[PDB]
Amino acid sequence: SGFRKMAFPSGKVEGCMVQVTCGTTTLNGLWLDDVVYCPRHVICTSEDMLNPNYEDLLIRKSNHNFLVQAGNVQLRVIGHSMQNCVLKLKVDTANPKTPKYKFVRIQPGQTFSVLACYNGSPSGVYQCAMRPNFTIKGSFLNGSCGSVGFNIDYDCVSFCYMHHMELPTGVHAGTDLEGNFYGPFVDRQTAQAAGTDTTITVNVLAWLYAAVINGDRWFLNRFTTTLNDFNLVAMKYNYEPLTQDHVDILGPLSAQTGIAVLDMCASLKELLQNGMNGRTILGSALLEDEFTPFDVVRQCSGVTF
Amino acid sequence: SGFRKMAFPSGKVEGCMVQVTCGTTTLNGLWLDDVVYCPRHVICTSEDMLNPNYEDLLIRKSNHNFLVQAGNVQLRVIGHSMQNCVLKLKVDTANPKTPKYKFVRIQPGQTFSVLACYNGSPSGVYQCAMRPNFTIKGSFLNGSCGSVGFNIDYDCVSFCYMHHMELPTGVHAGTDLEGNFYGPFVDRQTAQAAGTDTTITVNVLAWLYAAVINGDRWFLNRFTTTLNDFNLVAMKYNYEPLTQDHVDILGPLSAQTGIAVLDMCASLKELLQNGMNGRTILGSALLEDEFTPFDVVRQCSGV
Ligand SMILES: *[C@@](O)(CO)[C@H](C[C@@H]1CCNC1=O)NC(=O)[C@H](CC(C)C)NC(=O)c1cc2c(OC)cccc2[nH]1
Numbered sequence: 007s008g009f010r011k012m013a014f015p016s017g018k019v020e021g022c023m024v025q026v027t028c029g030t031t032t033l034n035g036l037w038l039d040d041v042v043y044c045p046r047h048v049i050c051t052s053e054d055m056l057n058p059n060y061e062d063l064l065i066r067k068s069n070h071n072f073l074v075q076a077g078n079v080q081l082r083v084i085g086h087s088m089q090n091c092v093l094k095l096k097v098d099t100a101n102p103k104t105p106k107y108k109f110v111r112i113q114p115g116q117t118f119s120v121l122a123c124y125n126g127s128p129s130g131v132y133q134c135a136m137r138p139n140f141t142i143k144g145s146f147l148n149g150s151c152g153s154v155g156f157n158i159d160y161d162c163v164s165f166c167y168m169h170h171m172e173l174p175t176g177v178h179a180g181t182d183l184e185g186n187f188y189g190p191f192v193d194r195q196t197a198q199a200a201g202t203d204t205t206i207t208v209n210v211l212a213w214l215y216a217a218v219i220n221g222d223r224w225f226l227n228r229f230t231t232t233l234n235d236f237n238l239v240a241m242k243y244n245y246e247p248l249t250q251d252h253v254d255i256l257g258p259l260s261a262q263t264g265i266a267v268l269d270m271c272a273s274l275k276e277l278l279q280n281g282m283n284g285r286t287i288l289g290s291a292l293l294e295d296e297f298t299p300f301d302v303v304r305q306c307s308g309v310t311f
Numbered sequence: 312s313g314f315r316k317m318a319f320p321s322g323k324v325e326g327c328m329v330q331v332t333c334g335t336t337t338l339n340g341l342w343l344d345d346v347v348y349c350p351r352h353v354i355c356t357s358e359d360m361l362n363p364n365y366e367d368l369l370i371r372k373s374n375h376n377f378l379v380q381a382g383n384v385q386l387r388v389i390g391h392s393m394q395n396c397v398l399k400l401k402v403d404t405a406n407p408k409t410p411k412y413k414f415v416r417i418q419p420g421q422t423f424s425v426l427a428c429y430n431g432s433p434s435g436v437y438q439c440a441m442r443p444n445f446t447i448k449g450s451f452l453n454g455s456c457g458s459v460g461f462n463i464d465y466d467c468v469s470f471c472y473m474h475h476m477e478l479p480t481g482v483h484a485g486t487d488l489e490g491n492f493y494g495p496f497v498d499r500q501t502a503q504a505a506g507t508d509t510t511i512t513v514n515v516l517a518w519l520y521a522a523v524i525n526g527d528r529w530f531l532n533r534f535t536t537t538l539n540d541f542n543l544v545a546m547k548y549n550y551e552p553l554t555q556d557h558v559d560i561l562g563p564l565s566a567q568t569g570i571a572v573l574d575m576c577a578s579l580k581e582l583l584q585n586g587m588n589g590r591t592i593l594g595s596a597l598l599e600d601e602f603t604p605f606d607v608v609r610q611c612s613g614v
């Protein structure tokens with residue numbers, strides 16, 4: 007028993023982290039097969055990052071201008087190309103520790119493990135959830151760019167995040183492994199503000215299913231609702247609307263408890279309108295929204311990779 | 312910026328996790344050099360676990376009674392010994408992934424990373440704290456025994472915990488790598504209660520400093536308190552006493568924020584007496600006590 011924020015075992019990703027340096031600018035890169043992926047602003051000087059023209063700045067660079075190191079061992083760069091905001095550097099060595107992997111673009115509310123790295127050395131791992139405003143409430147210091155977020159199913163690692171930016175509010179923004187930013191942010195040295203955030207409804211519902219599984223079910227009422235009616239009410243409380251995919255991924259938890267998805271939506275709707283009334287759920291008076299239905303099943307069922 | 316429950320990278324430990332089976336009892340083992348460490352109750356049947364005379368059950372076991380599997384390869388046990396509640400299985404093959412390691416016993420209030428495993432396969436990693444009553448609030452299911460907790464310094468893994476049991480209240484208990492339990496627990500199949508838990512005061516203060524470093528200051532106040540007057544109120548709320556060593560350890564966080572430790576103590580006193588209302592600190596509605604001063608320093612230095 008017990009419910010904690012659980013990250014994936016990071017060994018498969020640790021063996022792929024390297025350091026990329028251009029001049030004095032250094033950050034982290036991801037070494038898969040014979041290609042190293044990293045943020046493209048590594049080619050920028052400190053003054054360049056204010057208003058960079060990555061097309062013009064990359065024209066002046068050659069393969070021999072890139073320092074890629076696995077620890078202290080240099081990997082000779084034999085080719086370079088740019089894809090959106092990520093740099094792809096071909097190296098002369100195929101990473102023997104390359105795991106079965108895939109590049110995926112996650113949705114808001116989806117969670118992933120972040121392997122915080124500095125100078126190509128992994129330092130920590132923790133769970134993050136993509137907020138509806140396309141930010142993540144992470145923990146990043148100087149030199150953390152290049153750090154990746156990932157999910158692991160069976161023996162396959164699904165990379166979904168590469169770190170780029172810290173907003174003035176202390177939250178963080180990045181791209182997928184194809185260089186496309188999550189949200190409307192750009193890789194420039196400017197103060198960028200994110201939209202107003204909302205609560206991840208599908209994850210709150212998953213957290214309620216988790217409580218029911220553990221015998222905590224006072225909040226179950228005899229009401230039901232339509233998906234459209236619930237979505238309209240939920241937005242009034244700064245809650246995200248549910249998609250068809252959200253209803254589907256809640257299927258297993260619904261079948262395990264015998265509580266239909268729309269019935270639990272009606273239960274959640276009551277909690278939003280009348281409040282919690284001095285009671286708690288799973289020991290907390292706050293509704294938790296950073297546990298996905300998979301996170302609840304994976305933790306309540308001990309799945310392995 | 313930002314502050315999160317952060318664990319060490321588990322790669323160095325993943326390369327040491329194996330599966331140990333004896334009869335129909337299966338759990339996790341830790342493979343270091345040519346030795347496999349696992350909880351000794353693996354030699355017990357379901358009926359043996361009720362009242363096990365481990366010295367008796369062990370002498371009746373043979374090397375071939377232990378099935379050790381490392382991935383898809385079976386390791387041959389060429390020797391077996393017992394150190395307290397930890398079984399030591401000597402194998403004929405040395406683990407090539409064995410990192411630089413040490414076995415240490417953690418103190419209450421200290422944190423460590425847990426690599427939860429099932430059937431010898433790593434499943435998840437998270438950070439725990441050794442509660443003053445020598446329990447931990449983890450996430451363990453059936454088959455989690457054998458899972459270890461650890462810290463990493465440079466390239467050295469310091470193993471400090473191996474999981475054994477879950478109390479009726481939902482918290483968990485285990486031993487160090489020498490087989491000695493943390494707390495007054497025994498590896499028998501009985502419902503066991505822990506001592507009254509207290510709050511790790513030095514950790515709460517460090518976490519309040521992390522909140523100030525990240526822009527949370529609503530709980531601060533202009534008042535100050537003496538160390539003894541703070542401890543009087545703290546003990547009243549089942550908080551652990553704050554020593555001068557704790558005050559010294561919080562020094563770096565005090566210098567970075569410019570808030571004296573005894574000033575933060577006055578803030579915590581007000582929080583304990585008045586509560587938090589509906590407000591939150593670092594997204595939490597409760598006072599967090601599982602972050603050590605060094606945990607805060609590592610994440611908020613230079614911010
Ligand atoms: C990477 O390590 C850079 O390689 C670094 C990561 C942040 C540093 C501190 N914590 C982090 O997560 N990223 C940056 O410094 C980026 C560089 C961009 C992508 C070119 N810049 C920011 O994150 C940034 C710039 C500014 C700013 O300007 C002016 C004003 C306010 C906030 C801000 N954040």
Ligand SMILES: *[C@@](O)(CO)[C@H](C[C@@H]1CCNC1=O)NC(=O)[C@H](CC(C)C)NC(=O)c1cc2c(OC)cccc2[nH]1
Binds near residue numbers: 479
């Ligand atoms: C191991 O996986 C067993 O190898 C298991 C880990 C717990 C299982 C559930 N969640 C866990 O962390 N440990 C146990 O099952 C141990 C067995 C040995 C002999 C210590 N037992 C318990 O944890 C346990 C037994 C009892 C009990 O009896 C009667 C009554 C109430 C609680 C309880 N916990």
